[PDB]
Amino acid sequence: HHSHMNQLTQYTITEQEINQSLAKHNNFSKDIGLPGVADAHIVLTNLTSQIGREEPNKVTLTGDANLDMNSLFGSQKATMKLKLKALPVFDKEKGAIFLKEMEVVDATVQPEKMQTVMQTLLPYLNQALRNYFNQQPAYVLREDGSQGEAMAKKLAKGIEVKPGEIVIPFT
Ligand code: NA
């Protein structure tokens, strides 16, 4: 019965909850690189997370990107599979979890000639990613959801990353 808080001492956010939230909040569509030389517009979709399985305190993400790579002489479409890693950090003020310092762990690009361009543009993509996800939270605690979530917002004593899920202690 919904009148009883599942958990009384903490609140838990699963990989699946983070994924659905990202699916809502992730609208990453940015320009990366050097206009007129190697300048890509990149849209990131389908971000799926893995919580705290490698580095105990870090999160991993897989996603797809579509790119339009541009130069003064033309453009070419590219697609990309990415693996990313980030550091979840809780902002008490906003009652929100941010995936900070996001960077590309591995990437595969098609077509082939776009492979070397993207390797060069990697640090630009890293910049766009961490600027985007440093300010767009991955998860925001609401007051009009479960009572547990309401209580996390009010009491949250930071977060703790465990295998498979993010825990927000009330204590
Ligand atoms: Na940027």
Side-chain angles (χ1 to χ4, degrees):
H1 191 84
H2 42 281
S3 67
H4 308 289
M5 300 174 47
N6 186 25
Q7 290 193 105
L8 292 162
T9 75
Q10 64 182 37
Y11 179 73
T12 300
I13 297 160
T14 65
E15 269 150 340
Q16 189 163 309
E17 294 170 83
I18 291 294
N19 293 165
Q20 288 174 64
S21 189
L22 283 177
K24 310 301 185 299
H25 299 140
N26 159 53
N27 300 277
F28 181 99
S29 182
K30 294 303 184 187
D31 296 291
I32 59 175
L34 304 167
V37 187
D39 173 35
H41 190 74
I42 174 169
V43 184
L44 188 62
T45 52
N46 299 321
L47 284 180
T48 300
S49 76
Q50 285 285 263
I51 293 167
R53 305 195 190 166
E54 300 200 68
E55 279 103 279
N57 63 322
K58 294 187 192 302
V59 166
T60 257
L61 294 168
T62 58
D64 298 310
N66 290 293
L67 294 83
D68 293 293
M69 172 72 54
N70 310 107
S71 208
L72 65 132
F73 290 126
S75 52
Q76 173 80 122
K77 278 171 153 47
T79 68
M80 182 166 316
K81 228 98 37 60
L82 294 174
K83 176 182 181 182
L84 307 179
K85 62 181 297 301
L87 178 74
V89 335
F90 186 71
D91 185 315
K92 312 180 182 66
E93 321 167 344
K94 305 202 182 60
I97 298 171
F98 289 89
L99 297 172
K100 297 194 157 291
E101 317 175 332
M102 203 184 288
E103 71 181 319
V104 166
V105 166
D106 348 278
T108 65
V109 177
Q110 303 274 61
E112 214 161 73
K113 219 256 76 57
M114 299 300 103
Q115 271 163 15
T116 310
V117 184
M118 275 307 301
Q119 192 62 46
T120 285
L121 288 188
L122 236 284
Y124 293 89
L125 177 54
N126 282 338
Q127 180 185 117
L129 254 7
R130 73 182 178 271
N131 280 330
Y132 186 75
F133 293 98
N134 285 358
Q135 302 243 21
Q136 166 62 68
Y139 197 93
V140 173
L141 303 173
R142 306 171 60 85
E143 304 181 37
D144 51 38
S146 66
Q147 186 175 15
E149 181 171 344
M151 289 303 117
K153 185 171 168 50
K154 172 183 171 174
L155 305 169
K157 296 300 190 175
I159 59 178
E160 189 182 355
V161 184
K162 296 203 94 210
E165 57 184 21
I166 297 190
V167 172
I168 300 173
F170 296 165
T171 189

